[PDB]
Amino acid sequence: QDFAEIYARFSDERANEQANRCSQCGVPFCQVHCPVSNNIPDWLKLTSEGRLEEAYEVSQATNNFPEICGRICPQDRLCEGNCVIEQSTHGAVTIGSVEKYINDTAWDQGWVKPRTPSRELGLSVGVIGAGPAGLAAAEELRAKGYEVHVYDRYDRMGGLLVYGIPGFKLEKSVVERRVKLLADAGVIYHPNFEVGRDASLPELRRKHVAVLVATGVYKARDIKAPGSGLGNIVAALDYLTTSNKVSLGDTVEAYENGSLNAAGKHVVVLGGGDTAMDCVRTAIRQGATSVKCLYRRDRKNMPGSQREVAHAEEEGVEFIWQAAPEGFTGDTVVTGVRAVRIHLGVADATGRQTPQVIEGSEFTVQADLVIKALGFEPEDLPNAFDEPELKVTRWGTLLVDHRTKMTNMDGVFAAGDIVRGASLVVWAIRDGRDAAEGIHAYAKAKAEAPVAVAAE
């Protein structure tokens, strides 16, 4: 119970040791493997020299949220995955760690990030949602020299980085540092505006050159039915934020006097991905005696990368986990106005590999608390309505061109989780990155000024 930096990756100045270790390889695989295409050889060489500012600059240029990504990026899946040194005994370089460290010193310095001189100045541009995607898009646009406002539904900013990813993994001051750097650009953020009844694309059309839809996947998945927190049930959407608010100081002005959620007795967390593992770990934070992570699918196909699963494992969370098919939750039993247990059916994979649930075999797992980890999705109809005319795919998500990230409407762009195509902070920042050039091309055209092609 308490939120210390659990990350294995975190490095002290000792990061110097690994920096020297890095081969500083040509046409490095790691960079090619990085979504934002960070120049890892150069920033690393820099830390080796000890000039943290230089590495920080290199990092920030490619990604606006270099700090958060250094801490959060599933590197094994990403840049470290193609690290050459992996062949060696020592193993791959922890690029994420060095990125965090270099970034951290920069934070300490307190330097502000200046604007480049000028460009097609900027008809109002609006971005919806304060998360990684919008922040990245907004900062690049501002680099271009435009006037932009981000409308955020919540009082807090930072998106999932603030709301859900645990403090032990992601300190809040980190997200605050990046937003401030963006702010120096002059990007304005206003907190209690929502794309919905209040704001809509047509409303924006009333004077607004372009819009970026950054809102992510606001809601969580279905089976629990009306179940209440008092009873026991909490969706990741509910649970993570409450822990976040109590745990992270800058996030909200109000002190959650309520304090951390009281979680007592056995906790069942349902989900394979990052969300489930974070909720499992956060649960112990709030006093859970035991935590069970239940997967529909087999152990082999756990969604989260090994580093994060490692945190839960060290933690001693139990994984009841077997067969590709679903240990699937049939029902939650509540007695005494409190959840006593959850009923599951065993599932197993056939040659078809299509999942099968075998009704005959059931498991009654006793649990005081259930947190549903399955994931998130857009479903709020007024929100969707806000989006018109923009075309939605049969995934019920806004369609966008992969390259331009332009929506059916030329003026509107979208990026991040909302696109449903990537589920990582660095891809979301990348989405905004790519979008910014295109919004730029579009606006400049309005200006009647050309953009090369190369983009830069």
Partner: protein, 105 residues
């Protein structure tokens, strides 16, 4: 009767190989001819440090300069000739004393 302008030339080197560009310039010229870091790190460096040439490995799987996307200098299109069966190549290390680089004006 020949003027070996060798010593006369070495003299001035020891007297100071001079530099006159400010890093702000260096970089932009370099940029003109698309130079890079690989270029300074991989290749230029070992020449200065070791007095020798970047050895490396695996094939060359970049495109062929004409088909390249990026600026590539004339010399990339000029491939070096070597001899195969007709004649034998020489050992410039073990047999350096027979070779030579004397230049006359």
């Amino acid at each position: 009767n020949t003027t070996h302008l060798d010593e006369l030339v070495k003299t001035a080197s020891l007297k100071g190989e001079p530099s006159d560009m400010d890093k702000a310039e260096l970089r932009r010229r370099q940029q003109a001819f698309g130079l890079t870091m690989e270029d300074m790190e991989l290749i230029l460096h070992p020449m200065v440090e070791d007095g020798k040439e970047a050895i490396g490995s695996m094939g060359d799987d970049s495109p062929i300069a004409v088909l390249s996307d990026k600026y590539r200098g004339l010399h990339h299109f000029f491939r070096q000739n070597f001899s195969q069966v007709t004649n034998p190549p020489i050992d410039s290390l073990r047999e350096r004393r027979v070779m030579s680089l004397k230049t006359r004006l």
